[PDB]
Ligand binder design. Structure first.
Ligand code: HEC
Ligand SMILES: *[C@@H]1O[C@H](CO[C@@H]2O[C@@H](C)[C@@H](O)[C@@H](O)[C@@H]2O)[C@@H](O)[C@H](O)[C@H]1NC(C)=O
Ligand code: UEY
Ligand code: NAG
Ligand code: NAG
Ligand code: NAG
Ligand code: NAG
Ligand code: MAN
Ligand code: CA
Ligand code: CL
Ligand code: CL
Lengths: 103, 464
């Protein structure tokens, strides 16, 4: 890290002088709780047929979506105190914060 | 081959199809899914974790880029004006459009076969995901060039690097001001804003500014705000005929609509004068994203809410009760206790029917089911995860706009007068914009004012 800087780097490197990759791009996320995997270290819950999560069968994400998320489109309730710009700024802001790559 | 196979083999984690599905009747089919790249691939020592390809800071990295080669390719380097490169094939009524990207398999070309309009190139790869997002990226591209042009006339000896950096620093501060002064209070509500974001004091180098793994899933609460259409309005804020309400499953990757259907002005007008969808416990997310996500550019329509749940499992995220415990909130064990936490025994019964225990409810699902806090659009759990994240991004940022040394007192006072409605005035043909707060104001003409009434950013303090 250069001892004196006027502007941010593009990657976020050197923002934190004591731990210079903190907040920088292409680094692993921090975890606030230890991960919970089927085998303890890698396999997600839902991977192996018959393997329960904390005493109960794992529910299919699509079945949760069908039974709880699903609603008739014509019954949509408009927000009387929020503009569609409130939604859009959120996605634009999210795209300043995180992008999780896949293979 | 995740895109087409249903076999569960790494790196695929396809979503299986339940019986009597409302859309997918073939149970041998599936919803495609790729597991996120591991931080330590092939390991049998480290507990699997995922990667953030972006800078966590609110530094307008979605405009400037998070990697140096891309950031150079985004700038106009044919002169010393410190500009961002603009589209050389098309213009929006004389105004700049984002450059086109050179993608091998371009999904934007699939949305209109005969138009031949490819994806746009911005600081973040998802800029062409919806024309509303493209409009916001295009607006910030114009704002950077507008700032670098005003700074050049004010300080003629400044070179291209100085002009780019100085305009970049302003745009980054503008993104921080809109986000923390106008946006976050309306997400958290007053009490969670006071609790998780107390008055800024100064930079703290012991505050870890990284994005937490759980935040990448918790911040998907925004999916509950998505309307099923893209709304476009004319100069008088009336529907722009004959396509003013195009379904969202026909706007994903549709860069041709920005280029050939009137530019960003009709879109920005529609974002301002159309209400957001309200999150209700029986109206969580629309079927344009639940049933037809990316329908035109893929073999099958995706389910965004279901992908969010599969992604939390892929990321090894703990369940609802562990996150409630982390946040210092009570952890319900029976249907009656969950009914009290959600103020809805019916929703608690359905959550119990799926999960068996509130310990297994997926973080996005549990988070978006909570009743909304007063004057906010999230409940107790999500307000905690989101507030904790945004406090770390502000307190742990050495270049935070209010940090001593970043801007002069005079520059901080000039920046305090910025607003998103004024950025629309300066960079578009729109002459009537929302009154502050832009995120609340949603009805024309009641919540609207003229450009002439909003003062512009005074760059006088930037003169050397
Ligand atoms: C205010 C919050 C918010 C809004 C609004 C929002 N998203 Fe999300 N979305 C996210 C976040 C956060 C992620 C995770 C990003 C990451 O780290 O890769 C995400 C992820 C996604 C993903 C990846 C899904 C997967 O496999 O895990 C898709 C697809 C997506 N969003 C589509 C949309 C679409 C379509 C829009 C609207 C045009 C949108 N989102 C609006 C925050 C939001
Ligand atoms: C600087 O911040 C350090 C980290 O504090 C933790 O994170 C921040 C964002 C808050 O949420 C706080 O409640 C957490 O404890 C502290 O160790 C340190 O004492 C702080 N120092 C000063 C002077 O504020
Ligand atoms: N992490 C992501 C990823 C994408 C897609 C890729 C994708 C993911 C899942 C299913 C299908 C396609 C993308 C679009 C454009 C460029 C890069 C990526 C997003 N689109 N909006 N928000 C998004 N967040
Ligand atoms: C080059 C071209 O086809 N332009 C078309 C126009 O002719 C048509 O009237 C309109 C509606 O389909 O869409 C655009
Ligand atoms: C691992 C975990 O859940 N830790 C929590 C902590 O975050 C919380 O602040 C405290 C008080 O509720 O209880 C403990
Ligand atoms: C760079 O700036 C000049 C001057 O405004 C302009 O004519 C040129 O087209 C720009 N190039 C790009 C790639 O934007
Ligand atoms: C695609 O765009 C062209 C404009 O060039 C338009 O004529 C055509 O109707 C559009 N096609 C569809 C299916 O929307
Ligand atoms: O009551 C809420 C509880 O969690 C939060 C923190 O600010 C704690 O100090 C407090 O005791
Ligand atoms: Ca960033
Ligand atoms: Cl985490
Ligand atoms: Cl070009």
């Amino acid at each position: 890290c250069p001892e004196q800087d006027k502007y941010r780097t593009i990657t976020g490197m050197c923002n934190n002088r004591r731990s210079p990759t903190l907040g920088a791009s292409n680094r692993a996320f921090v975890r606030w709780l230890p991960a919970e995997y089927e085998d303890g270290f890698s396999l997600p819950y839902g991977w192996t047929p018959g393997v329960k999560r904390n005493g109960f069968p794992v529910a299919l994400a699509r079945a949760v979506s069908n039974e709880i998320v699903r609603f008739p489109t014509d019954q949509l309730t408009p927000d009387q105190e929020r503009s569609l710009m409130f939604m859009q700024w959120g996605q634009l802001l999210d795209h300043d914060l995180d992008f999780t790559p896949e293979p | 081959n995740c895109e087409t196979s249903c076999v569960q083999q790494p790196p695929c984690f396809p979503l299986k199809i339940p019986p009597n599905d409302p859309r997918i009747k073939n149970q041998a089919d599936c919803i495609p899914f790729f597991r996120s790249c591991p931080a330590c691939p092939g390991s049998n020592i480290t507990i699997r974790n995922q990667i953030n390809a972006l800078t966590s800071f609110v530094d307008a990295s979605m405009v400037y880029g998070s990697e140096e080669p891309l950031a150079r390719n985004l700038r106009n380097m044919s002169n010393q004006l410190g500009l961002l490169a603009v589209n050389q094939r098309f213009q929006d009524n004389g105004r700049a459009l984002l450059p086109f990207d050179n993608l091998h398999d371009d999904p934007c070309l699939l949305t209109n076969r005969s138009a031949r309009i490819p994806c746009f190139l911005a600081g973040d790869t998802r800029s062409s995901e919806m024309p509303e997002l493209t409009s916001m990226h295009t607006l910030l591209l114009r704002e950077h060039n507008r700032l670098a042009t005003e700074l050049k006339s004010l300080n003629p000896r400044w070179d291209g690097e100085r002009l780019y950096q100085e305009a970049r620093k302003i745009v980054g501060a503008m993104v921080q001001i809109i986000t923390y002064r106008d946006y976050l209070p309306l997400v958290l509500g007053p009490t969670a804003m006071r609790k998780y974001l107390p008055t800024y004091r100064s930079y703290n180098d012991s505050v870890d500014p990284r994005i937490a793994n759980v935040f990448t899933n918790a911040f998907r609460y925004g999916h509950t705000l998505i309307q099923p259409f893209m709304f476009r309005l004319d100069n008088r804020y009336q529907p722009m005929e004959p396509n003013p309400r195009v379904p969202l499953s026909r706007v994903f990757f549709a860069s041709w609509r920005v280029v050939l259907e009137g530019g960003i002005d009709p879109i920005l007008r529609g974002l301002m004068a159309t209400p957001a969808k309200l999150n209700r416990q029986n109206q969580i997310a629309v079927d344009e994203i639940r049933e037809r996500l990316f329908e035109q550019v893929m073999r099958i329509g995706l389910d965004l809410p279901a992908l969010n749940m599969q992604r939390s499992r892929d990321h090894g995220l703990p369940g609802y009760n562990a996150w409630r415990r982390f946040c210092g909130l009570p952890q319900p064990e029976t249907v009656g206790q969950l009914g009290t936490v959600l103020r809805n025994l019916k929703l608690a019964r359905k959550l119990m029917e799926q999960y068996g225990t509130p310990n297994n409810i997926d973080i996005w699902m549990g988070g978006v089911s909570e009743p909304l806090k007063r004057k906010g659009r999230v409940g107790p759990l999500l307000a905690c995860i989101i507030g904790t994240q945004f406090r770390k991004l502000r307190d742990g940022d050495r270049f935070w706009w209010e940090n001593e040394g970043v801007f002069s007192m005079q520059q901080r006072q000039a920046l305090a007068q910025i607003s998103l409605p004024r950025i629309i005035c300066d960079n578009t043909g729109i002459t009537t914009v929302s009154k502050n707060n832009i995120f609340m104001s949603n009805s024309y003409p009641r919540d609207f004012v003229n450009c002439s009434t909003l003062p512009a950013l005074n760059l006088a303090s930037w003169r050397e």
